[PDB]
Amino acid sequence: MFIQEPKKLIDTGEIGNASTGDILFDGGNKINSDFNAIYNAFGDQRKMAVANGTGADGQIIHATGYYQKHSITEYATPVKVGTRHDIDTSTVGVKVIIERGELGDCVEFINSNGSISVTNPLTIQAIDSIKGVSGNLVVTSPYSKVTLRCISSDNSTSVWNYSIESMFGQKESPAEGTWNISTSGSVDIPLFHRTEYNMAKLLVTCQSVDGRKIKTAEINILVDTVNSEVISSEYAVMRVGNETEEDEIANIAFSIKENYVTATISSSTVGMRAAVKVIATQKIGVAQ
Amino acid sequence: MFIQEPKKLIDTGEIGNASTGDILFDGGNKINSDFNAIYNAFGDQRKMAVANGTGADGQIIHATGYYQKHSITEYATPVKVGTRHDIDTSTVGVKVIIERGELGDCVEFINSNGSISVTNPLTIQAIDSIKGVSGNLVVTSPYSKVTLRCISSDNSTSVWNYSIESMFGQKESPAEGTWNISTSGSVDIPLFHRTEYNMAKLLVTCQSVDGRKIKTAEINILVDTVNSEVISSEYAVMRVGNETEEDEIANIAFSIKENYVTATISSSTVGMRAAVKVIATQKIGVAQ
Amino acid sequence: TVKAPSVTSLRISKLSANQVQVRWDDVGANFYYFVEIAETKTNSGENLPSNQYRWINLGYTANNSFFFDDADPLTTYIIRVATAAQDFEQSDWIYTEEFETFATNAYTFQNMIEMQLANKFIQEKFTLNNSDYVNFNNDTIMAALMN
Amino acid sequence: APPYPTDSVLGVTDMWTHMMGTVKVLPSMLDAVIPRRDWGDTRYPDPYTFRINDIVVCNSAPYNATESGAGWLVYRCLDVPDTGMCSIASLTDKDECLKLGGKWTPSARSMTPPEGRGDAEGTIEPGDGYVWEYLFEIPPDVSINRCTNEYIVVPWPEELKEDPTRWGYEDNLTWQQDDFGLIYRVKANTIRFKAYLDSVYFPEAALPGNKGFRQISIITNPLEAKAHPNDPNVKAEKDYYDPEDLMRHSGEMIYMENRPPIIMAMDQTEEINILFTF
Amino acid sequence: DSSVIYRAIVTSKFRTEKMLNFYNSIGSGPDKNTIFITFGRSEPWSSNENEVGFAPPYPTDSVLGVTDMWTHMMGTVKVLPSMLDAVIPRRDWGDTRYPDPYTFRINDIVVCNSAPYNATESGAGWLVYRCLDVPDTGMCSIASLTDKDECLKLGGKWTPSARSMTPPEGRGDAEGTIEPGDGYVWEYLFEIPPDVSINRCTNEYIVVPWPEELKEDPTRWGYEDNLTWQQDDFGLIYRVKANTIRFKAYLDSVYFPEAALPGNKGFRQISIITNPLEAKAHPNDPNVKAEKDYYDPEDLMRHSGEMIYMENRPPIIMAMDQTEEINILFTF
């Protein structure tokens, strides 16, 4: 970890009315160090052991930013907030000890190769507390993302709530939205391009304009590839303004239309607000 | 894409003991170029065709950073890692070819307007491999986020696992936590402000202090707006330390309390750890 | 489709240690030439990679000749040139009898006559060739007249 | 491996001795051909990686096919992605590699096989590393029947003189008026002989149990058999002649061939292709 | 293991065949090739070009290379088919200059009557014999064999020990030196009449007759006498297996005075072109093949026709009142 100073600014009351070289001799010291933090932030600080971030091999800025990789010896010291780190615990489980932070202080960290396991756990000390974490949090997750945020600093109390996320995967929802069931009492909604998912799961809520009749069902669908169909399973049915134990407040029908999985949601009731939300999906790729 | 050099630093052994202008004449070349990467990172590199990032129209820094928009001609060349890009494939499907990266190397990309479709797919070559992706990954998702991370570089082998995410939506969980079932054998937990969701789905696990009795159920709830109620569907019941096929190891009750959906989890067994986790929710907004 | 033929007369015209002036014959016009250097010995033994030795290139070149100053004094090196131009088969990669650039060699030369140099200057600057001793073009020079 | 053939009046005689059967060749069985390479074909290496001036066929196959309702297309690839590899290990720049003339292998694969009749297309504007020049389109009928998956058939200029359209060449630009010398542009040096052997013309060699014919020979301009040697000579029209029905030694055989034995059989139908590279 | 492995060869005749065809392909006006031959580049390769050992840069083939060669081009000359002849290397009996005048190897082809020492018979043009059989004693090309017959039984070449006593003679179909005695036998071909000898023949290369031109006179070529059994034949070139055609051309200063003028550094490089088209004022006008013998490069359409063969030389200086000659041959 190359240490950065804060911003360090030049005196313009210097220069043309004062000794040029000297006041500049100072200014470079700033400027040089000044960009260092910049490039050390968005590039490998191990590039300082190189030409000191200079040359074509020198530290470059990543619009994505860079997650600084280092030895454990460096993280053996409380590591400052605001930093992006990438460390892989394949070698061993580590503690990443973090300074007492401030409200809003962030700590971003990742294991890119996902070497983190129980055999390769990751311990963290953010001083005086981490919300939800008694003592030091341990991280066994491969391809996880360590993000700390200090939600209280106060006087002595650095309270870090904690977020962590799998660095990869398919996290999107193909279809989420809301509409009102037409005067026709139905519609057809393209859900996803018929090829995007073998499985999806969605939740539709059909609610009256006055909100009294609101329809809910548990939608589990099997996309049928060869037949260009989608097989549904509905259950756990719930209602409020239901006037009949039969299909009520609306109806849920499915289809594949225009290379889209297309749900057809029909309500005998006019002025029914239906929010179509696909909560989870699945598709099959290659083996392994 | 405006090309950046790496960090390029000034000699202070120059200046006051050497020719002032010259050593400075050089230094500006650094400094100018030096900030360029900075502003080109966090601002539009198409602002260089402007006053070269100068003036009020000049490149500005985005604390969020900027996703660099360009022609395909530029991405027709392997695009360096660390970069944030925004391209919209409405014009056409594109390949974004990426250099062979390093362990930890990131590539961030988005389509802001979500023009990406199957008609507007997005192809990517990150050299020698992308984990899970045979050949070049194609992206048809609107409002997706292309994030590559090189999880192996090694010698020749740039292994890119891949994350992608819908740039928008409601991704929060209103209620997640853990507690121990009281000596009273129950509690009331505010889940969300009663208005936040028409639907939610949560998972509670009630486990004994010694962990032998652990209770699990599949919780599907319909928030009842007019009645200020919440309708539940429980099924797929699973247990371990269950002593009775009836309600066992704990009980799950619901309510809306203090403008909060409030689950009341009652266990006849004392010292029962209950983790309340709301996995999925739904609310209805406006049509369209 | 056919080889850029070759240089014929191919030689190292002079040896000042770590430096060579190599002469290959010019052969055809507008043919640049591919000049190689390869390594006889590892300094452990001699010609230890008789084959299997490394190659390094000086690039293509213009003219009939190239001047080369590098590496070590006293050490034996293979060099190889290949003629080429635009549309050809590649040249033959012709070899020399090579050499080793001996020890200390330095400059033997004129200057404006009156001037009197200080030995240590060239003694370092040239015999030891180190440009750091004075990197002249850049460096600053006090010029002191004298009692 | 049969013994390496011998060329001599002796060698001729022997080959002329054993000769089972003879078949003519109509010029329409002679075509110019170039090695076929299709965009996107997985099986073979670098389906997506093209070198300058390579010639690419499109629409040949579903993965190939961009466009239905058109015969095969033939594009040549003018420019290749900037990143790549040089044939000369000394050079890391495509432009420098090529400015010197060493070959360059590009790193980046093609997105799509090229399209459009126009002059260099090349997927140049929107973006790509490859640029594409159009040549002509091959009509389907000729494709299926002529094409060997290694070698597309290249049209004759005369045959071209007939339809510029059926060959898709009508579209372009020659500025010399008719041109049609297209084969110059592709620089096909290779002709494909196609021939058809059938048992019926030569049942005797077709009969069950033949060990087959070892060796093959082509002959040019033989003269018919004559009962009376003073009778005027006759060149040979019919498609097949028993070697008997041909005059001894008549015509010249350019090309002699020896193989491990192949056994013909009746009701079998055997096919021969021969490619001369001039 | 390789399943099928086969062997095949093209006869040397097919070389000839291409030629005879190729000879056919030069047309008069229509639909058969027309040939122009061009020189250019006054410009010096490099200052060296004059000096000994200078090799001009090896020519380049490209639309670029064409243009450049097409750029400098001084002058152009057509070629009539009658300046194109098949030829084989001339070898004379008894000729001191060349090795073993008296020692001939099987199938070698020997010319008679060419020279006084050669000449057996007056009042006849040159003769052409091939030498079928050589003395028995000799040496084998395959070092393993000391017998001619055994050398040949394997097929290795044989060099005979005994020199020829006399140059072959007789029209007679077999007739080398068979009865009385010798090691050599000689095969007769045809006799060459003197004028053609004189005008065509280069002492290295006799000129070989065309089958067509032969169809005109079998006698003038002395071929009328023989025996063919195929009827008319005249395909003689097949028998001799000449693979080599001779282009002959004649440059004269007069067609191109401008490149001929005193002080021209001469033309560096040469280029031949096939079926070029005339210059046209209006590009929509139909193309025209080129009849006249020489064209300033202007009077020819840019790039029209194809040029097969490009050449680069040290500068050659044409001069007025000089008459310079070019020969180019081809083995197909």
Asked whether A66 and A72 are in contact (CB, 8 A), the reply is no
Alpha-carbon E55 to chain mean position? 25
Residue with tokens 């004269």: E252
Counting every residue, how long is chain E?
Answer: 332
Query: CB atoms < 10 A from the CB of A215, how many?
Result: 29
Task: Please return the burial class of A287, using the count of CB atoms within 10 Å of its CB with bins 0-12, 13-18 and 19+.
Answer: exposed
Asked whether A186 and A267 are in contact (CB, 8 A), the reply is yes
Q: What is the rounded distance in angstroms from the CA atom of residue B122 to the CA atom of residue B137?
A: 8
Three-state DSSP class for residue E142:
coil
Q: What is the rounded distance in angstroms from the CA atom of residue D188 to the CA atom of residue B63?
A: 60
Question: B95 and chain D: CB distance < 8 Å anywhere?
Answer: yes
Asked whether D194 and D205 are in contact (CB, 8 A), the reply is no
- Measured CA to CA in angstroms, residue B247 lies from B156, B206, B269, E102 at distances of 59, 12, 11, 124
Structure tokens at D231: 């009778």
- Measured CA to CA in angstroms, residue A88 lies from A78, A283, B160, D78 at distances of 18, 30, 16, 45
Structure tokens at A236: 């756990």
Q: Which residue of B has its CA nearest to A84?
A: B104
Asked whether B124 and B96 are in contact (CB, 8 A), the reply is yes
Could you tell me the end-to-end alpha-carbon distance of chain B, in angstroms, rounded to an integer?
Answer: 37
Homologous superfamily of domain range A170-283? 4-oxalocrotonate tautomerase-like (2.60.40.1680)
Question: D127 and chain B: CB distance < 8 Å anywhere?
Answer: yes
Within D81-201, strands assigned E span: 84-86, 104-106, 132-138, 151-154, 190-198
Q: What is the rounded distance in angstroms from the CA atom of residue D14 to the CA atom of residue B146?
A: 73
Q: Which residues from chain D sit within 8 angstroms of residue E14, using beta carbons?
A: 252, 254-255
Q: Which residues from chain D sit within 8 angstroms of residue C60, using beta carbons?
A: 90, 100
CB-closest option in E57, E61, E65 to C29 = E57
- Contacts of residue B33, Cβ cutoff 8 Å, sequence gap at least 6: B4, B5, B8
Asked whether D20 and D212 are in contact (CB, 8 A), the reply is no
Q: Which residues from chain D sit within 8 angstroms of residue E232, using beta carbons?
A: 233
Three-state DSSP class for residue E148:
helix
Choose the CATH number for A67-169 among 3.30.930.10, 2.60.120.640, 3.30.1360.40, 3.40.30.10.
2.60.120.640
Interface of B with A in 244-273 (CB under 8 A): none
- Measured CA to CA in angstroms, residue E227 lies from B235, D229, E174, E214 at distances of 111, 12, 12, 16
Asked whether C84 and C73 are in contact (CB, 8 A), the reply is no
- Identity of the amino acid at D148: T
This structure's resolution (Å) is 6.8
- Identity of the amino acid at B23: I
Nearest to D126, CA basis, from A167, B87, B201: B87
Within B111-198, strands assigned E span: 122-126, 137-138, 145-152, 159-164, 176-181, 188-193
User: What string of DSSP letters covers D108-132?
Assistant: SPPSS----SSSS--S-SS--S--E
Nearest to B69, CA basis, from B113, B25, B127: B113
Alpha-carbon D232 to chain mean position? 38
Mutate to test the interface with D, among C56, C86, C91, C93 (most CBs of D within 10 A): C86
Three-state DSSP class for residue A88:
coil
CB-closest option in C2, C4, C29 to E45 = C29
DSSP B45: G
How far apart are the CA of B119 and the nearest CA of chain A, in angstroms? 11
- Contacts of residue D200, Cβ cutoff 8 Å, sequence gap at least 6: D206
Three-state DSSP class for residue D75:
strand
Ordered by where they begin, the domains of chain D are 1-31+190-278 (2.60.340.10), 32-189 (2.170.290.10)
Q: What is the rounded distance in angstroms from the CA atom of residue D42 to the CA atom of residue B134?
A: 12
Pair type for strands D255-258 and D151-154: unpaired
Could you confirm whether domain B17-51 is CATH 1.20.5.960? yes
Is it true that the peptide bond before B13 is cis, omega within 30 degrees of 0?
Answer: no
Structural domain span for residue C55: 2-103
CB-side exposure of E292: number of CA atoms within 13 Å?
A: 11
What subunits touch chain A, counting only 3 or more CB pairs under 8 A? B
Three-state DSSP class for residue A152:
strand
Nearest to D155, CA basis, from D132, D136, D140, D174: D136
- Measured CA to CA in angstroms, residue A131 lies from A80, A100, A141, B278 at distances of 18, 13, 19, 19
Residue numbers after which chain E breaks, C to N beyond 2.5 angstroms:
none
User: What string of DSSP letters covers A221-285?
Assistant: EEEETTTTEEEEEEEEEEESS-S-SSS-S-EEE--EETTEEEEEEE-SSSSEEEEEEEEEEE---
Three-state DSSP class for residue B140:
coil
Q: What is the rounded distance in angstroms from the CA atom of residue B157 to the CA atom of residue B128?
A: 6
Alpha-carbon A237 to chain mean position? 32
The dihedral through the CA atoms of D114, D118, D121, D126 has a sign that is negative
Test A67 with B34 for CB contact under 8 angstroms. no
Q: What is the rounded distance in angstroms from the CA atom of residue A77 to the CA atom of residue A95?
A: 10
Rounded to 10°, the helix B20-42/A20-42 angle is: 30
Q: What is the rounded distance in angstroms from the CA atom of residue C10 to the CA atom of residue C35?
A: 11
Three-state DSSP class for residue A12:
coil
How far apart are the CA of E278 and the nearest CA of chain D, in angstroms? 11
Q: What is the rounded distance in angstroms from the CA atom of residue B96 to the CA atom of residue D128?
A: 10
Residue with tokens 């200063």: E253
Spell A161-189 as b/e; 16+ CB within 10 A means b.
ebeebebbebebbbbbebbbbbeebbbbb
Test A59 with B6 for CB contact under 8 angstroms. yes
Three-state DSSP class for residue E306:
strand
Asked whether A162 and A137 are in contact (CB, 8 A), the reply is yes
Question: B60 and chain A: CB distance < 8 Å anywhere?
Answer: no
How far apart are the CA of E57 and the nearest CA of chain C, in angstroms? 5
How far apart are the CA of C84 and the nearest CA of chain D, in angstroms? 8
Phi, psi at C69, each rounded to 5°: -130, 110
Structure tokens at C62: 């213009």
Pair type for strands C65-69 and C76-84: unpaired
Nearest to A206, CA basis, from D78, B287, E266, C19: B287
CB-closest option in D7, D233, D260 to E6 = D260
Domain residue extents for chain B: 17-51, 67-169, 170-283
Q: Which residues from chain C sit within 8 angstroms of residue E61, using beta carbons?
A: 87
Phi, psi at B126, each rounded to 5°: -100, 125
Q: What is the rounded distance in angstroms from the CA atom of residue E296 to the CA atom of residue A16?
A: 73
Three-state DSSP class for residue A102:
coil
The angle subtended at Cα E147 by Cα E141 and Cα E151, nearest 5°, is: 45
Task: Please return the burial class of A147, using the count of CB atoms within 10 Å of its CB with bins 0-12, 13-18 and 19+.
Answer: middle
User: What string of DSSP letters covers E221-263?
Assistant: TTGGG---SSSS---HHHHHT--EEEEEEEEEGGG-HHHHSTT
E interface toward C at CB cutoff 8 Å?
Answer: 45-46, 48-49, 55-58, 60-62, 65
Q: Which residues from chain B sit within 8 angstroms of residue A171, using beta carbons?
A: 163-166
Q: Which residues from chain C sit within 8 angstroms of residue D100, using beta carbons?
A: 32, 60, 84, 86
Q: Which residue of E has its CA nearest to D2?
A: E6
- Contacts of residue D162, Cβ cutoff 8 Å, sequence gap at least 6: none
Structure tokens at B6: 């790496």
Test E6 with D255 for CB contact under 8 angstroms. no
C interface toward E at CB cutoff 8 Å?
Answer: 2, 4-5, 26-31, 85-88
Could you tell me the end-to-end alpha-carbon distance of chain C, in angstroms, rounded to an integer?
Answer: 74
